[PDB]
Design an enzyme around this catalytic site. Structure first.
Site, short mmCIF file in Angstrom:
data_model
loop_
_atom_site.label_atom_id
_atom_site.label_comp_id
_atom_site.label_asym_id
_atom_site.label_seq_id
_atom_site.Cartn_x
_atom_site.Cartn_y
_atom_site.Cartn_z
N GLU A 11 0.79 -1.23 0.00
CA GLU A 11 0.00 0.00 0.00
C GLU A 11 0.82 1.28 0.00
O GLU A 11 0.30 2.33 -0.37
CB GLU A 11 -0.96 0.01 1.19
CG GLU A 11 -1.98 -1.11 1.18
CD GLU A 11 -3.02 -1.00 0.08
OE1 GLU A 11 -3.12 0.05 -0.60
OE2 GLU A 11 -3.77 -1.99 -0.10
N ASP A 20 -6.32 6.24 -4.92
CA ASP A 20 -5.87 4.86 -5.01
C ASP A 20 -5.90 4.34 -6.46
O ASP A 20 -6.16 5.10 -7.40
CB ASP A 20 -6.64 3.94 -4.03
CG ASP A 20 -8.10 3.68 -4.44
OD1 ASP A 20 -8.52 4.03 -5.55
OD2 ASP A 20 -8.84 3.09 -3.62
N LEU A 32 -8.81 3.84 2.71
CA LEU A 32 -9.83 4.40 1.81
C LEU A 32 -10.71 5.38 2.58
O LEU A 32 -11.24 5.05 3.64
CB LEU A 32 -10.67 3.27 1.22
CG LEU A 32 -11.88 3.65 0.37
CD1 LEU A 32 -11.46 4.36 -0.91
CD2 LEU A 32 -12.72 2.42 0.05
N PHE A 104 -8.36 -6.57 3.09
CA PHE A 104 -7.95 -5.17 3.22
C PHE A 104 -8.14 -4.43 1.91
O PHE A 104 -8.65 -3.30 1.89
CB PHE A 104 -6.49 -5.13 3.68
CG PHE A 104 -5.99 -3.77 4.07
CD1 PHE A 104 -5.59 -2.84 3.11
CD2 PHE A 104 -5.84 -3.43 5.41
CE1 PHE A 104 -5.09 -1.59 3.48
CE2 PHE A 104 -5.33 -2.19 5.78
CZ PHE A 104 -4.97 -1.27 4.81
N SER A 117 -12.31 -20.21 -5.53
CA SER A 117 -10.95 -20.06 -5.00
C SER A 117 -10.90 -20.46 -3.53
O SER A 117 -9.97 -21.14 -3.10
CB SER A 117 -10.46 -18.61 -5.12
OG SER A 117 -10.45 -18.12 -6.45
N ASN A 132 -7.01 -20.18 -10.18
CA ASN A 132 -8.36 -19.65 -10.08
C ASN A 132 -8.39 -18.20 -9.60
O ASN A 132 -9.16 -17.39 -10.11
CB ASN A 132 -9.24 -20.54 -9.20
CG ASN A 132 -10.69 -20.17 -9.28
OD1 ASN A 132 -11.21 -19.43 -8.45
ND2 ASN A 132 -11.37 -20.67 -10.32
#
Length: 164
Positions: A11, A20, A32, A104, A117, A132
Site C-alpha cells: 500500500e 488509489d 480508503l 484489506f 478459489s 483460479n
C-alpha cells in the site's frame, strides 16, 4: 515479515490525501476515505477518522493508527463472515496474512465472492487455487500485487516479499 510489513509494502505510505488504484480518495497506508468524487467529502471523512480538523495531511503516527484499525477490521470482517471464517481457520499463519491482505484491498463482501478459489484454498489445492485466483478483475487490474498475494497462497512462504 508479517501482515503489517506485507501491507505496508503493498500500500505504501502517503501523508496527504491521494487517489488509489481505482481513483478513490485515500490516505496513509491504503486507508480508503470515500468512493465519492468530492475532495471535500473525502476531507470530511478524514477529519472524522482522525478526530481533528486536518488540512488533508496527517502525521506518520496518525497513519499508523488508522492502519492498525484497518488491519484489525479486516480480521474482524473475516471472522464474522460465514464463508470466510472456515477457510481462514483452515490456513497456516502465512496464508492467513494473504487472506487479510485480500480483504484489506477489496473488502469482506468482495472476497466472499471468490467462492471457487476459497474452496480450493480450504482443500489445500494450492496450484489450482492460484490459477483460479488469477481469473479475476482483481488480478487484471493490480497484477503485480495480486501475483505477490497469490504466490503467498501458493507457497505459504514470504518469498514474494523478499528483495522488495
Amino acid at each position: 515479515m508479517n501482515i503489517f510489513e506485507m501491507l505496508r509494502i503493498d500500500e505504501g505510505l502517503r501523508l496527504k490525501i491521494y487517489k488509489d488504484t481505482e481513483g478513490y480518495y485515500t490516505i496513509g497506508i491504503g486507508h480508503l476515505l470515500t468512493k465519492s468524487p468530492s475532495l471535500n467529502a473525502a476531507k470530511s471523512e478524514l477529519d472524522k477518522a482522525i478526530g481533528r480538523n486536518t488540512n488533508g495531511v496527517i502525521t506518520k503516527d496518525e497513519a499508523e493508527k488508522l492502519f492498525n484499525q484497518d488491519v484489525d477490521a479486516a480480521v474482524r470482517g473475516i471472522l464474522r463472515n460465514a464463508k470466510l471464517k472456515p477457510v481462514y481457520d483452515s490456513l497456516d499463519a502465512v496464508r492467513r496474512a494473504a487472506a487479510i491482505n485480500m480483504v484489506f484491498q477489496m473488502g469482506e463482501t468482495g472476497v466472499a465472492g471468490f467462492t471457487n478459489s476459497l474452496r480450493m484454498l480450504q482443500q489445500k489445492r494450492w496450484d489450482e487455487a492460484a490459477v483460479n485466483l488469477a481469473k479475476s478483475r482483481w488480478y487484471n487490474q493490480t497484477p503485480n500485487r495480486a501475483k505477490r498475494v497469490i504466490t503467498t497462497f501458493r507457497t505459504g512462504t514470504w518469498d514474494a516479499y523478499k528483495n522488495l
